[model samples]
Target: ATPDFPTHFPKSSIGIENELAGLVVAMPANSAQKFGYVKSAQGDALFMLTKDMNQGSYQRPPSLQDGKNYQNWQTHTVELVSYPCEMDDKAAVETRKQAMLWLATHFTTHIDQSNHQPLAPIQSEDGRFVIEITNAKHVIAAGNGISAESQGQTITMTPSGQQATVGVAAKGFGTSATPELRLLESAPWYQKSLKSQFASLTSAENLDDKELAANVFAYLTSIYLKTAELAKKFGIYINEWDPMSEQITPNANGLTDPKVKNAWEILPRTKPSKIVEILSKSDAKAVMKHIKPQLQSRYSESLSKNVFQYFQDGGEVAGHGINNATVGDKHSPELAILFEFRTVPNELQSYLPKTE
Candidate 1:
């Protein structure tokens, strides 16, 4: 079970299950003194590798008359592929976040170390981003497919000209440019209810009060830590509960767990497949139980119940009522709102869309 407090669980391990996808954009280098990447989503890139382009007419690499002003000239599109990982949603999000950070660090290093012109501009669009190389005549990434390493790939430049087509591919997950944005912004669960619950436990002067708060908050966030078994049951319930809503459709039977049935039933009407288990009540309780005494004994005097309650309630159920639940709602759960299926609904208002 995922704990709701910082001291309870290692701060590093708090939210690790969030999933994200990565997209790689690269550009080839030209002899020109200048080259750069483009950020237009409307245009298409000449996806090819060093060898592939050598076979074509502009067979020679494009002339790098000047490298700086024309930095946009050298660029290419490299596809990156990533398989699903077993990490929890929160942790997965962190992994992606870290991966992007790594990418930026490495990309910057490569840009500075190599004489190659700048790579394509990775532009973010409506939940998506484009990496384009205008002067594919120049730079290229070396790799078999988009693996963590940059090998099995190389760039070949001949005196005749620069090759514009590089065919190496890279793979990543998550379609919407969310992973990128998320990596750039704050960590997930900026306003998690479990966090609020943790804060509440801190304010209790007595062990019992701390334990109680822990128990309640643990139960509340159980929804977030459910396992695959819980996901299946929840999905089934959603399918049967409101067939008219057409929100959920049944899939393979292996995903369900009986333990999740009752809890699944209590969830507001929606598609079940969309729901994922984050925690079990017992697991959550155990975690809180472990942390309760520390909060009460160490920090109770300085804690604020009002803040805790506000965060808990405000974070758990931000999207209520039919109007906000509709498919068209921009702030719908599928988009701006994210919930941990383990605990009861804790509306994370900070993560949700705000009214203009």
Candidate 2:
């Protein structure tokens, strides 16, 4: 058995050392502090239990502590699988180095941290599957019947022959009701008689808020689950400061549609176990009927494209692309070369920013 040595690979190092380790561990810095010192043999089989950074509430056993917790420290499991590199040299050191380099280059690394940028969390305004900044830019009507900052920027979405404009903005949204419902507290005798004639309509009007809460909950579950899917696909997670529970917005009879099926499709990937449990009992057929058209209309574009490309360019250019990001110029190849080849930091400022 080959003895494995614990390696300290800083995230600042070249290529996969930083990214691959992040995926294997599957936790961010704060969560990592709670679950310390991942263990693996030959970098293949690996496991990390949650760490207890606090005094004694939940830290792992002292025996399991790898003890080096630096922001730059990225723990990686590097496997040394024995295979014939070249028929000529059985114990060639150069072969081992080359093989190691190959593994380092192609291995899967978690790029979720990079996706935590200010603009990365936006989605398409049209409720389409296309995840992008457009989603976060919608316009919303204020509670006072006036447009406010909460109303996101308006977007134009054309699907088939249907054309509608949607506004994308941050959550905590408010939209005005079309032909707003009027409260008939002091109705005329005829109106009262009409209301009485349709007892079901009155019953619906005065439905217990709590009795309808589950239906609303189902609708919200559908939205948040979709959001989680976008986040996961983009290699991003909702920030620690952001309250995960607050994102749910339920329309009337939220879950009585096809969205339930969509939630089921994405459940395995996002893995919101409690939310999934509640949705399991929901009507799958009804959920699909409502969400299918919405999904087709809203989600058809790539949510993670910009973010993924940003990271790819950033990694390739070694963070220059990230620092110098602009509306249209950040992803250009000229910018990549400027950062890739330029040596002096100051010289890079003028000559490097210009890309062909």
Candidate 3:
């Protein structure tokens, strides 16, 4: 079967190549290293992956190693999907090309042996769904809490390997999209959680202690899954999300609210598995309650006694958008994510940074 190439084409030559093959850099021998590829034979798919370079900062030479440890193209599960819902061919080209380029650049810039960036082991490589970045220039945080470098690093990538993307500029993230249903449109705060998750992993507290870090990671992961699951009833579509043992997040209890059920009802794309069928309004928050002591280590406030500020710090340092990050610039976007949460809930609002 012929591969279904992207509908839109990139403006730059290399940009065009990346959109097709993840990252294509031709070196002295005039060879292209396929860092990533668009498996489009399944029909206009935009679930892309990225790669790196010895020729350009955009791409690295391909590996010829049958050697077990040789990493030709290292990959992480940073969430940046490029599938356009309904854009013209021109912008679509830009979207796809940009996604692939970022993926490629991420590997090239970070994995530079010259910099000793210790190509971190592939935290994840299996991308089963679509998740995109902001089409707008979103803020990481507005205050002095997070340093510019930390702020940038926070959004650079996540534990899930979700890389950030900047969609078309102006009003909002031109396409600050994510998931099969583009749920970020409804609840954009989820993006910030990824940053927090990233920070916690590299945070000072967890560095020396491995098992402690693992527990926190599992807790955070559980919370994230629960949060994602709560969004199902709000009208979004995520296909085949089967949470594993460590990945403990319960699913929704079906449409209970009569108002929601009465007015043009909608449901999730995938059926909730039997495993996490237990219902609770604050399943995510419940886990947060249990994990608070651990989160307390990386998460504590001496300056601000305010619980709101405490959670804000938790969101920034730990993950989530609970921290009133409403500094709207729309041009400088961070790693994007959106889901269909009706709201992060005032009760649990204190658990994260702040929802936009």
Per TM-score, the best of the predicted structures is 3
Clashes of 2: 32
lDDT of 1 at 21: 18
User: By TM-score, how accurate is candidate 3?
Assistant: 0.20
The per-model lDDT (C-alpha) reads 0.28, 0.23, 0.28
- Model 2 Cα displacement at 282 (Å)? 6.3
* Higher-TM-score candidate of 2 and 3: 3
Candidates sorted by TM-score, best first: 3, 1, 2
Task: Return the TM-score for each candidate structure.
Answer: 0.19, 0.17, 0.20
TM-score-wise, the better of 1 and 2 is 1
Candidate 3 local distance difference test against the native: 0.28
- Residue-pair clashes per candidate, as listed? 93, 32, 35
For model 3, residues 1-356, the per-residue Cα lDDT tens digits are 22222322121111111122111222222222222333232235454332222322212213322333322322222223343333224544444544444444444444332122222323224442222321111111111211212222211322222222212211122123423223322333223344345445454432443333333334243333433333333431222333332243534332333333222112111111111112132433333343444333432232112222233233221123211111123354222122212222232222121112
Candidate number with the higher TM-score (1 or 3): 3
